[PDB]
Structure formats: structure tokens, C-alpha cells
Amino acid sequence: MKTEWPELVGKAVAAAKKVILQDKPEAQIIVLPVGTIVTMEYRIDRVRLFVDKLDNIAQVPRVG
């Protein structure tokens, strides 16, 4: 199980989702501004996308 997509740093949301969904078709994908404070719960279904003000992936997307 691949759980990180470092290769998507700097990509637009639309482009990113396309790759993630190929790897994890039933992923729950949430978009948040980078810097948003999140909790430590581990959600195996989830992949959070932290984006910058240009709407590009700012941090390595990972399952959690």
C-alpha cells in the first residue's frame, strides 16, 4: 500500500486528485489551506490536500 504522493507537491488540485484516485479509488479527499491545525486521528480512508494561495499542493499528500 502506497500512502504518500511526494511527486504531487506543487500540482493543482485537479491534477493531484486524478493520480490519487488511480492509486486509491475510494479515497475520501479533503482540501485545506496549508497551515490548518488538524488532530492526530488516523483515518485510513482519508487523504488531505494542503494547498497554498495559488491552489497548488504545498505539502506531501498522505493517507491519514
Short mmCIF file of N, CA, C and O in Angstrom, two decimals:
data_model
loop_
_atom_site.label_atom_id
_atom_site.label_comp_id
_atom_site.label_asym_id
_atom_site.label_seq_id
_atom_site.Cartn_x
_atom_site.Cartn_y
_atom_site.Cartn_z
N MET A 1 0.84 -1.21 0.00
CA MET A 1 0.00 0.00 0.00
C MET A 1 0.87 1.26 0.00
O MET A 1 1.64 1.54 0.94
N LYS A 2 0.72 1.99 -1.09
CA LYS A 2 1.43 3.28 -1.24
C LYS A 2 0.59 4.24 -0.37
O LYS A 2 -0.66 4.16 -0.44
N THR A 3 1.22 5.10 0.40
CA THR A 3 0.40 6.01 1.23
C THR A 3 0.81 7.47 1.18
O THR A 3 0.27 8.27 1.95
N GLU A 4 1.74 7.78 0.29
CA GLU A 4 2.23 9.16 0.17
C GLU A 4 2.46 9.47 -1.29
O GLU A 4 2.84 8.53 -2.01
N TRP A 5 2.24 10.71 -1.68
CA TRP A 5 2.44 11.12 -3.09
C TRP A 5 3.29 12.39 -3.15
O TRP A 5 2.80 13.46 -3.52
N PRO A 6 4.56 12.26 -2.80
CA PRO A 6 5.52 13.37 -2.81
C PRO A 6 5.65 14.09 -4.15
O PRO A 6 5.94 15.29 -4.32
N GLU A 7 5.43 13.26 -5.18
CA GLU A 7 5.51 13.67 -6.58
C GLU A 7 4.43 14.68 -6.92
O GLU A 7 4.62 15.32 -7.97
N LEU A 8 3.42 14.82 -6.09
CA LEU A 8 2.35 15.79 -6.38
C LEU A 8 2.55 17.15 -5.75
O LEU A 8 1.65 18.03 -5.88
N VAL A 9 3.68 17.36 -5.08
CA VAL A 9 3.91 18.68 -4.45
C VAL A 9 4.03 19.68 -5.61
O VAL A 9 4.77 19.37 -6.57
N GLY A 10 3.29 20.77 -5.48
CA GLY A 10 3.31 21.83 -6.49
C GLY A 10 2.26 21.68 -7.57
O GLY A 10 2.14 22.58 -8.44
N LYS A 11 1.52 20.60 -7.56
CA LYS A 11 0.47 20.36 -8.56
C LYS A 11 -0.86 21.02 -8.17
O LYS A 11 -1.14 21.32 -7.00
N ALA A 12 -1.68 21.25 -9.20
CA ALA A 12 -3.01 21.84 -8.98
C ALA A 12 -3.86 20.72 -8.38
O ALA A 12 -3.54 19.52 -8.60
N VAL A 13 -4.91 21.06 -7.65
CA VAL A 13 -5.80 20.07 -7.02
C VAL A 13 -6.36 19.07 -8.02
O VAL A 13 -6.35 17.83 -7.80
N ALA A 14 -6.88 19.61 -9.12
CA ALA A 14 -7.48 18.77 -10.17
C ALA A 14 -6.51 17.69 -10.64
O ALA A 14 -6.87 16.49 -10.73
N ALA A 15 -5.29 18.12 -10.93
CA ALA A 15 -4.25 17.16 -11.38
C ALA A 15 -3.95 16.12 -10.31
O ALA A 15 -3.84 14.91 -10.61
N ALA A 16 -3.81 16.55 -9.07
CA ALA A 16 -3.47 15.68 -7.94
C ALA A 16 -4.47 14.56 -7.68
O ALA A 16 -4.07 13.39 -7.55
N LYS A 17 -5.74 14.95 -7.61
CA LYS A 17 -6.83 14.01 -7.36
C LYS A 17 -6.84 12.86 -8.36
O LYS A 17 -7.09 11.71 -7.98
N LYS A 18 -6.55 13.19 -9.60
CA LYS A 18 -6.51 12.25 -10.72
C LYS A 18 -5.50 11.13 -10.46
O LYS A 18 -5.73 9.93 -10.74
N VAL A 19 -4.36 11.50 -9.90
CA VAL A 19 -3.34 10.47 -9.61
C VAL A 19 -3.73 9.66 -8.36
O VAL A 19 -3.54 8.43 -8.36
N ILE A 20 -4.19 10.39 -7.34
CA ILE A 20 -4.54 9.71 -6.08
C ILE A 20 -5.64 8.65 -6.29
O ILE A 20 -5.58 7.55 -5.73
N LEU A 21 -6.63 9.08 -7.07
CA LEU A 21 -7.78 8.17 -7.29
C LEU A 21 -7.42 6.93 -8.08
O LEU A 21 -8.16 5.93 -7.96
N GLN A 22 -6.31 6.99 -8.78
CA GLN A 22 -5.85 5.80 -9.53
C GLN A 22 -5.29 4.82 -8.51
O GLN A 22 -5.58 3.62 -8.66
N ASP A 23 -4.55 5.38 -7.55
CA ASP A 23 -3.96 4.53 -6.51
C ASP A 23 -4.95 4.10 -5.43
O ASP A 23 -4.82 2.96 -4.96
N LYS A 24 -5.83 5.01 -5.07
CA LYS A 24 -6.83 4.70 -4.00
C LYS A 24 -8.18 5.19 -4.48
O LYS A 24 -8.61 6.30 -4.11
N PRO A 25 -8.82 4.38 -5.31
CA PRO A 25 -10.11 4.74 -5.91
C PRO A 25 -11.17 5.18 -4.91
O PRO A 25 -11.93 6.10 -5.31
N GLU A 26 -11.24 4.63 -3.71
CA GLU A 26 -12.32 5.09 -2.81
C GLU A 26 -11.84 6.07 -1.76
O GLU A 26 -12.44 6.18 -0.66
N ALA A 27 -10.79 6.81 -2.09
CA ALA A 27 -10.27 7.78 -1.13
C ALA A 27 -11.25 8.92 -0.84
O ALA A 27 -11.92 9.37 -1.78
N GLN A 28 -11.23 9.33 0.41
CA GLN A 28 -12.02 10.49 0.88
C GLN A 28 -10.99 11.64 0.77
O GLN A 28 -10.06 11.67 1.59
N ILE A 29 -11.14 12.51 -0.21
CA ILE A 29 -10.18 13.61 -0.40
C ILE A 29 -10.73 14.95 0.08
O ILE A 29 -11.74 15.41 -0.47
N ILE A 30 -10.04 15.54 1.03
CA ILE A 30 -10.38 16.84 1.64
C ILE A 30 -9.25 17.83 1.31
O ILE A 30 -8.05 17.47 1.32
N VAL A 31 -9.66 19.05 1.06
CA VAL A 31 -8.76 20.15 0.73
C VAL A 31 -8.82 21.18 1.86
O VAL A 31 -9.92 21.65 2.22
N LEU A 32 -7.65 21.54 2.34
CA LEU A 32 -7.49 22.53 3.40
C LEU A 32 -6.31 23.45 3.07
O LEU A 32 -5.34 22.99 2.46
N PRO A 33 -6.42 24.69 3.52
CA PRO A 33 -5.31 25.64 3.30
C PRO A 33 -4.15 25.07 4.14
O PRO A 33 -4.38 24.56 5.25
N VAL A 34 -2.94 25.16 3.59
CA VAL A 34 -1.74 24.66 4.30
C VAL A 34 -1.63 25.47 5.59
O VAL A 34 -1.95 26.68 5.56
N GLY A 35 -1.24 24.84 6.68
CA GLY A 35 -1.12 25.58 7.95
C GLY A 35 -2.34 25.34 8.84
O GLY A 35 -2.28 25.68 10.04
N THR A 36 -3.39 24.78 8.29
CA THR A 36 -4.58 24.48 9.10
C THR A 36 -4.19 23.47 10.19
O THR A 36 -3.56 22.45 9.84
N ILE A 37 -4.60 23.76 11.41
CA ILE A 37 -4.30 22.84 12.53
C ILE A 37 -5.24 21.65 12.46
O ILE A 37 -6.44 21.93 12.40
N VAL A 38 -4.72 20.44 12.47
CA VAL A 38 -5.55 19.23 12.40
C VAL A 38 -5.29 18.37 13.63
O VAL A 38 -4.32 18.62 14.36
N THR A 39 -6.15 17.38 13.84
CA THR A 39 -5.99 16.48 15.00
C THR A 39 -5.12 15.31 14.57
O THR A 39 -4.83 15.17 13.37
N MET A 40 -4.72 14.50 15.53
CA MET A 40 -3.88 13.32 15.30
C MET A 40 -4.61 12.05 14.92
O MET A 40 -3.91 11.01 14.72
N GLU A 41 -5.94 12.06 14.82
CA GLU A 41 -6.65 10.83 14.46
C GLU A 41 -6.15 10.36 13.08
O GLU A 41 -5.83 11.18 12.21
N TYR A 42 -6.08 9.04 12.99
CA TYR A 42 -5.65 8.34 11.78
C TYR A 42 -6.89 7.78 11.08
O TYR A 42 -7.59 6.93 11.65
N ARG A 43 -7.13 8.25 9.86
CA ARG A 43 -8.29 7.83 9.04
C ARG A 43 -7.71 7.23 7.77
O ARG A 43 -7.24 7.96 6.89
N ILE A 44 -7.75 5.91 7.70
CA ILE A 44 -7.22 5.14 6.58
C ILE A 44 -7.87 5.40 5.22
O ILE A 44 -7.31 5.11 4.15
N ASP A 45 -9.07 5.95 5.25
CA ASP A 45 -9.84 6.29 4.05
C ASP A 45 -9.48 7.66 3.49
O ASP A 45 -9.76 7.98 2.33
N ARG A 46 -8.91 8.47 4.38
CA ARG A 46 -8.62 9.86 4.03
C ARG A 46 -7.25 10.26 3.52
O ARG A 46 -6.20 9.74 3.87
N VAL A 47 -7.27 11.26 2.67
CA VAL A 47 -6.14 11.92 2.05
C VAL A 47 -6.46 13.43 2.04
O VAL A 47 -7.32 13.90 1.25
N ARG A 48 -5.74 14.13 2.89
CA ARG A 48 -5.86 15.58 2.97
C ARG A 48 -4.85 16.25 2.02
O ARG A 48 -3.66 15.89 1.94
N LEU A 49 -5.35 17.24 1.30
CA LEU A 49 -4.55 18.05 0.39
C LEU A 49 -4.40 19.44 1.01
O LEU A 49 -5.40 20.14 1.09
N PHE A 50 -3.19 19.77 1.39
CA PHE A 50 -2.86 21.09 1.97
C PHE A 50 -2.42 21.95 0.78
O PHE A 50 -1.43 21.63 0.12
N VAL A 51 -3.20 23.01 0.54
CA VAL A 51 -2.90 23.88 -0.60
C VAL A 51 -2.51 25.30 -0.20
O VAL A 51 -2.94 25.78 0.85
N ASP A 52 -1.75 25.90 -1.12
CA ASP A 52 -1.29 27.29 -0.93
C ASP A 52 -2.32 28.25 -1.55
O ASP A 52 -3.32 27.82 -2.14
N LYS A 53 -2.01 29.53 -1.49
CA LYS A 53 -2.89 30.58 -2.03
C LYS A 53 -3.07 30.55 -3.55
O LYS A 53 -3.98 31.23 -4.06
N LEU A 54 -2.29 29.76 -4.25
CA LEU A 54 -2.38 29.60 -5.70
C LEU A 54 -3.15 28.31 -6.01
O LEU A 54 -3.32 27.89 -7.17
N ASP A 55 -3.61 27.69 -4.95
CA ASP A 55 -4.38 26.44 -5.01
C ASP A 55 -3.55 25.24 -5.45
O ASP A 55 -4.10 24.27 -6.02
N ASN A 56 -2.25 25.28 -5.16
CA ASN A 56 -1.35 24.16 -5.51
C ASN A 56 -1.00 23.39 -4.24
O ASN A 56 -0.98 24.00 -3.17
N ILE A 57 -0.73 22.10 -4.43
CA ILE A 57 -0.35 21.23 -3.30
C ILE A 57 0.93 21.79 -2.66
O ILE A 57 1.93 21.93 -3.37
N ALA A 58 0.85 22.07 -1.37
CA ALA A 58 2.01 22.66 -0.66
C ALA A 58 2.78 21.69 0.22
O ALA A 58 3.90 22.01 0.67
N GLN A 59 2.18 20.55 0.51
CA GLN A 59 2.84 19.56 1.37
C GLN A 59 2.55 18.18 0.80
O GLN A 59 1.53 18.06 0.12
N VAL A 60 3.41 17.23 1.10
CA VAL A 60 3.24 15.86 0.62
C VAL A 60 1.91 15.28 1.12
O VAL A 60 1.68 15.14 2.33
N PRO A 61 1.07 14.92 0.16
CA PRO A 61 -0.22 14.29 0.42
C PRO A 61 0.07 12.89 0.95
O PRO A 61 0.93 12.19 0.39
N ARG A 62 -0.65 12.53 1.99
CA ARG A 62 -0.54 11.23 2.66
C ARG A 62 -1.86 10.73 3.25
O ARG A 62 -2.72 11.51 3.69
N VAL A 63 -2.00 9.43 3.32
CA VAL A 63 -3.18 8.79 3.90
C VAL A 63 -3.17 9.10 5.42
O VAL A 63 -2.09 8.94 6.03
N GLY A 64 -4.33 9.49 5.95
CA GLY A 64 -4.36 9.73 7.41
C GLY A 64 -5.48 10.66 7.85
O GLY A 64 -5.87 11.41 6.95
#
